[PDB]
Amino acid sequence: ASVLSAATATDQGPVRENNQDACLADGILYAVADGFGARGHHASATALKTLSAGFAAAPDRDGLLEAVQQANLRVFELLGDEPTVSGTTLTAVAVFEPGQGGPLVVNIGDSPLYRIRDGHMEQLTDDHSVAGELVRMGEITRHEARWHPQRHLLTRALGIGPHIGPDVFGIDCGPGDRLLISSDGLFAAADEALIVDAATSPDPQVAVRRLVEVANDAGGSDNTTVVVIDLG
Ligand SMILES: C[As](C)(=O)[O-]
Ligand SMILES: [Mn+2]
Numbered sequence: 001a002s003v004l005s006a007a008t009a010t011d012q013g014p015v016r017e018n019n020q021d022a023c024l025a026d027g028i029l030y031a032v033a034d035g036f037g038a039r040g041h042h043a044s045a046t047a048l049k050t051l052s053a054g055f056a057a058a059p060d061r062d063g064l065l066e067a068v069q070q071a072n073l074r075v076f077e078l079l080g081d082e083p084t085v086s087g088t089t090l091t092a093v094a095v096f097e098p099g100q101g102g103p104l105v106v107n108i109g110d111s112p113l114y115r116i117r118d119g120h121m122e123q124l125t126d127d128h129s130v131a132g133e134l135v136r137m138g139e140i141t142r143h144e145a146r147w148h149p150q151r152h153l154l155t156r157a158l159g160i161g162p163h164i165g166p167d168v169f170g171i172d173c174g175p176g177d178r179l180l181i182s183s184d185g186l187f188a189a190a191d192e193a194l195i196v197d198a199a200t201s202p203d204p205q206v207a208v209r210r211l212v213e214v215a216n217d218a219g220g221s222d223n224t225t226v227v228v229i230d231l232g
């Protein structure tokens, strides 16, 4: 697997007063960060700026994991003394060559990574939210979790303490696969079938536009940000 094509889109949506999502798509590194709190936009932007500088200076598995740690520390040092809590999720994919261990995902919070293969979209990451933990534990299905009242309550977040333990795992993927990283806004309310239809648009630049349109037409209750990566 190498990168054939990639695209990104971010949209405030019609409801939220600002856009606190951020995204990154540079070389082999792709990421979404969904900020929260009064300065969530400062948190997501700061996390991705820190991730990208850290990875650029050490572009391997260890360098990536360390950049994630530095992003946590930088957002925390900047925002940690504010009267209220702001922080961010982070989901990052590094499309490493085989000599570097192949594609790797690092995730903290509820911004999912999906693999799209033969028209079928499968979530690869676990969601660190109250509902997401119930799914992980096998207590409820993803369908049953859809309208869980604590769906949006994070159980892990970047930038809120000196200590973060992200999930870090190798991606089962190869030539012809598509990866999608998104903030949770995409799945706020839209019909899953309409999402999959948009997510499978052959041109990734069309896919990201259609994904934002699907989320907004479904009500646009949240910011939506999407990164689409085609592998060859
Ligand atoms: C990660 As959020 C609580 O701003 O959707
Ligand atoms: Mn947010």
Ligand SMILES: [Mn+2]
Residues within 6 Å of the ligand: 152, 184
């Ligand atoms: Mn949310």
Ligand SMILES: [Mn+2]
Residues within 6 Å of the ligand: 034, 183, 184, 185, 222, 223
């Ligand atoms: Mn969100």
